[PDB]
Design a protein around this ligand. Structure first.
Ligand SMILES: *Cc1cc2c(cc1C)nc1c(=O)[nH]c(=O)nc-1n2C[C@H](O)[C@H](O)[C@H](O)COP(=O)(O)OP(=O)(O)OC[C@H]1O[C@@H](n2cnc3c(N)ncnc32)[C@H](O)[C@@H]1O
Ligand SMILES: [Cl-]
Ligand SMILES: [Cl-]
Length: 383
C-alpha cells in the first residue's frame, strides 16, 4: 500500500486531467482506476467528443470552456497523439422554439464569441447534406470543434506518468476512510493513504458516494451512438462538414463529420435508459430505440448519411437534477474533492476541470469561479 500527496480515485476524463496537473507540479500522485484508461466501460470512449464555446446549457460555462480550449491546444503541442480538429460546431432548431439555440446565441453575444448566424435555406446551401425547414435558424461556431477523447486521456496519462505519477489499474476502490488530517482508500489490491483525495468515478459516483456519507441524487443513463455509412462528398471533415448539436421538436441530437471515412456519428442526447453501471448492457442494438431513434433524425435532416450502420457504441451519462456539474470540496472534509454528475456534456471541460481539481486539492480553493457547480446548491438536493 503506500502514502502519497494526493490520491485520485477514478482516472478517467476528469481524474487523468487532474493527475497531469498535479504531476506537472512535482506533487506525488497516485491514480487508481477499476480498468485501464482509456477504456470502454466508462463515459469517455467512442473516439470523439464535441467542444463548444457558445454554450446553450448556460452562458456561465463559457469561461471554463475557453480555458479548456486553450489547455487542449497546449496538450496538442505536448504529445504525439492527435487532440483536436477545428470542425466548427453548428447549432440549429425551429426559430423561436429552441431554448438551447437561444442561450447559445445569447452566450455568444455576452462573451463576444465569433459566430455566424444563418436561417432556413442558407443552412442547406452552405452545407450540402443538411436539410432543414425554412423556419429553422442556426448559429455556427467556426473555432470550436472535435476532441479525440481517448487520445486526450492516453496523452494526459503518458505525461503524468513521465512526471512520476503512479497509475494503479484494474483496481476497484471499495471503501473510503477519511480522517481530519489524511485520507485512505481500500481495494482488493491493498490500502493507500494520502493528504488529499480527488473522487472522480463517473457513473460509479452514483453508487459509491454514499461511502463518503454523501447522499446526492445522481442517475446514470445508457446513451448510444451510431456511425453510419455516409456520402463522403458531403459529410467528410475534409469538405468541412461540421460537428453539431441541434434541438428539434422531439429532442436534442449531436453528431460528428466523417473522419477518414469512419462515417457520420450521431447520438440522441435527451433520451436514454436509466441504468446501473455494474449491470448496464453495453451491446448496441438490444433496444429497438438504439438504431431507430438515430435513423429517424437522419432520414429527416441529413438523408445522405442514413446508410449502413458501420459501428455502434454504448456509453454512460451521469445526470444531476439540474444537469449542472458537481465540482467542490466535500461538505465535511476539506481534504476531499468531488467531481461528479457531468450530465452528458462534460468532456470538453475535462482539461479545465483537471486544473480546478488540482487547485482545490492542493489549496482548498481555485482561481476559477465554480459556484454554479457547488455541492451545497439547492437544485442539487444534496444531503
Ligand atoms: C457517454 C457519452 C458521453 C458524452 C458524449 C457521448 C457519449 C455517448 N459526447 C460528449 C460530447 O460530445 N462533448 C462533451 O463535452 N461531453 C460528451 N459526453 C460526456 C463526457 O464524455 C462525460 O461527461 C465524461 O466522460 C465524464 O468524465 P468522468 O471522468 O466523470 O467519467 P469517466 O471518464 O468514465 O471516468 C471515471 C473513471 O473512474 C473509474 N472508476 C469507477 N469506479 C471506480 C472505483 N470504484 N475504483 C476506481 N476507479 C473507478 C472508471 O473506470 C472510469 O475510468
Ligand atoms: Cl461517443
Ligand atoms: Cl456524464
Amino acid at each position: 500500500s503506500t502514502h502519497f500527496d494526493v490520491i485520485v480515485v477514478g482516472a478517467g476524463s476528469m481524474g487523468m486531467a487532474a493527475g497531469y496537473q498535479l504531476a506537472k507540479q512535482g506533487v506525488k500522485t497516485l491514480l487508481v482506476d477499476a480498468f485501464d484508461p482509456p477504456h470502454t466501460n466508462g463515459s469517455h470512449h467512442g473516439d470523439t467528443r464535441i467542444i463548444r464555446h457558445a454554450y446553450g446549457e448556460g452562458r456561465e460555462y463559457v469561461p471554463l470552456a475557453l480555458r479548456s480550449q486553450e489547455l487542449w491546444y497546449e496538450l496538442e503541442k505536448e504529445t504525439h497523439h492527435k487532440i483536436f480538429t477545428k470542425t466548427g460546431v453548428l447549432v440549429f432548431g425551429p426559430k423561436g422554439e429552441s431554448a438551447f439555440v437561444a442561450e447559445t446565441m445569447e452566450a455568444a453575444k455576452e462573451h463576444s464569441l465569433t459566430v455566424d448566424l444563418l436561417e432556413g435555406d442558407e443552412i442547406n446551401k452552405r452545407w450540402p447534406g443538411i436539410t432543414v425547414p425554412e423556419n429553422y435558424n442556426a448559429i455556427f461556431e467556426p473555432n470550436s470543434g472535435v476532441l479525440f477523447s481517448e487520445n486526450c486521456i492516453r496523452a494526459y496519462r503518458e505525461l503524468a506518468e513521465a512526471r512520476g505519477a503512479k497509475v494503479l489499474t484494474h483496481t476497484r476502490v471499495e471503501d473510503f476512510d477519511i480522517s481530519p488530517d489524511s485520507v485512505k482508500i481500500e481495494t482488493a489490491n491493498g490500502s493507500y493513504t494520502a493528504d488529499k483525495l480527488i473522487v472522480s468515478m463517473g457513473a460509479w459516483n452514483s453508487k459509491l458516494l454514499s461511502k463518503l456519507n454523501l447522499d446526492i441524487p445522481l442517475q446514470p443513463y445508457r446513451q448510444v451512438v451510431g456511425f453510419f455509412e455516409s456520402d463522403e462528398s458531403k459529410y467528410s471533415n475534409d469538405i468541412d462538414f461540421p460537428g453539431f448539436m441541434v434541438e428539434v421538436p422531439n429532442g436534442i441530437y449531436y453528431g460528428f463529420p466523417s473522419f477518414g471515412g469512419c462515417g457520420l456519428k450521431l447520438g440522441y442526447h435527451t433520451f436514454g435508459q436509466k441504468i446501473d453501471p455494474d449491470t448496464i448492457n453495453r451491446e448496441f442494438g438490444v433496444y429497438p430505440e438504439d438504431e431507430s431513434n438515430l435513423r429517424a433524425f437522419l432520414e429527416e435532416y441529413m438523408p445522405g448519411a442514413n446508410g449502413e450502420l458501420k459501428r455502434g457504441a454504448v456509453c454512460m451519462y451521469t445526470k444531476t437534477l439540474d444537469e449542472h456539474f458537481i465540482i467542490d470540496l466535500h461538505p465535511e472534509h476539506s481534504n476531499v474533492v468531488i467531481a461528479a454528475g457531468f450530465s452528458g456534456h462534460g468532456f470538453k471541460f475535462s482539461s479545465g476541470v483537471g486544473e480546478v481539481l488540482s487547485q482545490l486539492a492542493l489549496t482548498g480553493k481555485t482561481e476559477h469561479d465554480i459556484s454554479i457547480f457547488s455541492i451545497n446548491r439547492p437544485a442539487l438536493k444534496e444531503s
